[PDB]
């Protein structure tokens, strides 16, 4: 009947690769670069907007950094609309865990479930994968500041600093050079902005094409998503403007 | 050839 038009989206290549996962990764590699760097006292999220016009409003725009929770945030690389689906199920799961145990969800358990969902679209149901990769920046009362990455396959791994989207072999090579285990938050901020300015497919790096967020240490943890002006400021302070 | 038939 209809079996003629089924592109089998959950099948193996003769080499044991997952066609749609690999192709989905190809999709993601043309997405604005996003970087995550974990300092000894904080975490930094920075990513690049590929969508930019004079008339685009940036005060009211979000495209890459999303708040999951008071203590967890994600940098998105890929189909932003696929990302929002995945975000809300995650935003909910976090609230379900809070309701059940009266504790905030530990960072890995949320990342594990979100990757568990992705993995599913990989093995059954005949749907296409989510064209999305996530950098998770979170803090919890057991492992502290944490940095994770997940992709369309549903695999996740933890990082001292990592990049997703466009030009990651370039950016990842730069992060390997200048990253030190003992960095503070403001170092990582500069390592982050200075890596993007060297890998941008654009002319120069301006505030109107960045999103930026830092989670750092009163005895609790604040989560800050910079406004256009705050980014412009940080860009001069480090001398890129 | 093959008698799987009754």
């Amino acid at each position: 009947g209809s079996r003629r038009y089924d592109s089998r989206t959950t099948i193996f290549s003769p080499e044991g690769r997952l066609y749609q996962v690999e192709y989905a990764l190809e999709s993601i590699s043309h997405a604005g670069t996003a970087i995550g760097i974990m300092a000894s006292d904080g975490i930094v999220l920075a990513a690049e907007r590929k969508v930019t016009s004079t008339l685009l409003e940036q005060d009211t725009s979000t495209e890459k950094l999303y708040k999951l929770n008071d203590k967890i945030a994600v940098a998105v690389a890929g189909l932003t609309a696929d990302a929002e689906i995945l975000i809300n199920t995650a935003r909910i799961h976090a609230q379900n865990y809070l309701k059940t145990y009266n504790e905030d969800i530990p960072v890995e358990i949320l990342v594990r479930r979100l990757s568990d969902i992705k993995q599913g679209y990989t093995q059954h149901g005949g749907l296409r994968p989510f064209g999305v990769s996530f950098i998770y920046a979170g803090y919890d009362d057991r492992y502290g500041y944490q940095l994770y990455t997940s992709n369309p396959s549903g695999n996740y791994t933890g990082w001292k600093a990592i990049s997703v989207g466009a030009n990651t072999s370039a950016a990842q090579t730069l992060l390997q050079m200048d990253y030190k285990d003992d960095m503070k938050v403001d170092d990582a901020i500069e390592l982050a902005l200075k890596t993007l300015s060297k890998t941008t497919d654009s002319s120069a790096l301006t505030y109107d094409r960045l999103e930026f967020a830092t989670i750092r240490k009163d005895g609790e943890v604040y989560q800050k998503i910079f406004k256009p002006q705050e980014i412009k400021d940080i860009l001069v302070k480090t001398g890129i403007t | 050839w093959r008698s799987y038939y009754a």
């Binding site: 009947g1 | 008698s3 038939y5 009754a6």
Partner: protein, 232 residues
């Protein structure tokens, strides 16, 4: 045939249904079996087939009620499915209406069961042919079931490989065996002759011959083995 035979939901540009036609090919590879009837009895003769010298002889005849039974040629599993459905209907008729299921009506029900599996995607036609005999309120009956769905009432016929031999013979013997009334041994003898016209390098034995009879005052009975010696 090339592009139009991947399922039962595609007509050929000339109006054919290859999936159904290929089902008939399964019957043709099945072993020969013959049915014929007078005005008082109806008889089935089947040639049972073995695999090795060491194997049994695949059974070919299945009772459906005290008054109805059939012979099969083709995929034996599908006969199980169809004959089992036939047992259920015979039984429904008995329980709900205190009424033996008419052979004509079993035929209708079979046709309809099979036709479902020529308009259904994800299904397949039945790969078996059935000769159905019985004695009901209108007398002796013989039906031939085809996987197309076509059920037909005859005086005699044969299905399976080399079946043309017996079929041709029954066409000659017609006026003779219709009249074999009140003599069942003589109708079986008639059938055993008809089926012989379809042997090639084989003769009927106690191990491969299989016979069923039904009729007025004779509940559907199956003879195998030593019981069929009488007729060789």
């Amino acid at each position: 045939r090339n592009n139009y035979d991947g399922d039962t939901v595609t007509f050929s540009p000339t109006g054919r249904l290859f999936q159904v036609e290929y089902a008939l090919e399964a019957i043709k590879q099945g072993s020969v079996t013959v049915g014929l009837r007078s005005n008082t009895h109806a008889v089935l003769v089947a040639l049972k087939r073995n695999a090795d010298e060491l194997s049994s002889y695949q059974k070919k005849i299945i009772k459906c009620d005290e008054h109805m039974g059939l012979s099969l040629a083709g995929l034996a599993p599908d006969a199980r499915v169809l004959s089992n459905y036939l047992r259920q209907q015979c039984n429904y008729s008995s329980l709900v209406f205190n009424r033996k299921l008419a052979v004509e009506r079993a035929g209708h029900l079979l046709c309809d069961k099979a036709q479902k599996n020529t308009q259904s995607y994800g299904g397949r036609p039945y790969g078996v042919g059935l000769l159905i005999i019985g004695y009901d309120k209108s007398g002796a009956h013989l039906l031939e079931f085809q996987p197309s769905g076509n059920v037909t009432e005859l005086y005699g016929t044969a299905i399976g490989a080399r079946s043309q031999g017996a079929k041709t013979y029954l066409e000659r013997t017609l006026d003779t065996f219709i009249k074999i009334d009140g003599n069942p041994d003589e109708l079986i003898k008639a059938g055993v002759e008809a089926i012989s016209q379809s042997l090639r390098d084989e003769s009927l034995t106690v191990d491969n011959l299989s016979i069923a009879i039904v009729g007025k005052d004779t509940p559907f009975t199956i003879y195998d083995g030593e019981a069929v010696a009488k007729y060789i």
